[PDB]
């Protein structure tokens, strides 16, 4: 019994970034490097509040920053990125292994056109510290008041009054 509150359709009307999974995979490392702040803030909100109905604005801002990143890569390094993501898309598993020359062209293009460097191995998987300004959810699980603990057992022990007190056994 209650209300399943749901934000109206207007709040979740994001611009809906539209690139295929192969295109996303091609720009994975550079996007993670130069877009880490919105992703990290949004995910910390998601993990702390534990309520996607609450951190929708961070979901907006992450999409805004992703679209800005893709607009920059469109404006500066369109051709190498296009060839690289097409060559990634050809593979069934989308492995970076086969596509290394196009990766080199894309990397040098973004390095000398947008000042970017790909993260080294394992750099993109380190736990980061975010400087979010939202408060800490006091009751993320919405837990009710806990039952009071049972009365604690304490006190000095003396011999049982009149022994066992079990039938004729006096002692």
């Amino acid at each position: 019994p209650g209300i399943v509150e749901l934000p109206t359709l207007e709040d979740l009307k994001v611009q809906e970034v539209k690139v295929s999974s192969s295109v996303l995979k091609a720009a994975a490392h550079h996007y993670g490097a130069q877009c880490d702040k919105p992703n990290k803030e949004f995910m910390l909100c998601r993990w702390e509040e534990k309520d996607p109905r609450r951190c929708l604005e961070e979901g907006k801002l992450v999409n805004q920053c992703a679209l800005d990143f893709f607009r920059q890569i469109k404006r500066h390094c369109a051709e190498p990125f296009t060839e690289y993501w097409t060559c990634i898309d050809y593979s069934g598993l989308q492995l970076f292994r086969h596509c290394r020359k196009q990766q080199a062209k894309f990397d040098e293009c973004v390095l000398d056109k947008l000042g970017w460097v790909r993260p080294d191995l394992g750099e993109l998987s380190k736990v980061t510290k975010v400087k979010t300004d939202r408060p800490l959810p006091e009751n993320p699980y919405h837990s009710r008041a806990r039952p009071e603990p049972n009365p604690e057992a304490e006190g000095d022990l003396k011999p049982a009054k009149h022994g066992s007190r079990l039938f004729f056994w006096t002692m």
């Binding site: 998601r46 993990w47 049972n150 009054k161 009149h162 007190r165």
Partner: protein, 63 residues
């Protein structure tokens, strides 16, 4: 021996056994109450310990 022998001995025996009797009655009543409500040192029943619960951030955010 004198009658005071039996008199004082019966005093002690009667007092001790009366204490035993109403202690047994209190035992029965206390056992009934503690089994009915459980707000007592005994008749507690096992429950899952909380320290087994893991609180580390899982793969799914809103676990």
């Amino acid at each position: 021996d004198g009658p005071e022998k039996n008199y004082e001995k019966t005093m002690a025996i009667l007092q001790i056994e009366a204490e035993k009797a109403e202690l047994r009655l209190k035992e029965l009543e206390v056992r009934r109450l503690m089994r009915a409500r459980g707000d007592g040192p005994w008749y507690q029943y096992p429950t899952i310990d909380k320290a087994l619960i893991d609180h580390s951030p899982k793969t799914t955010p809103d676990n």
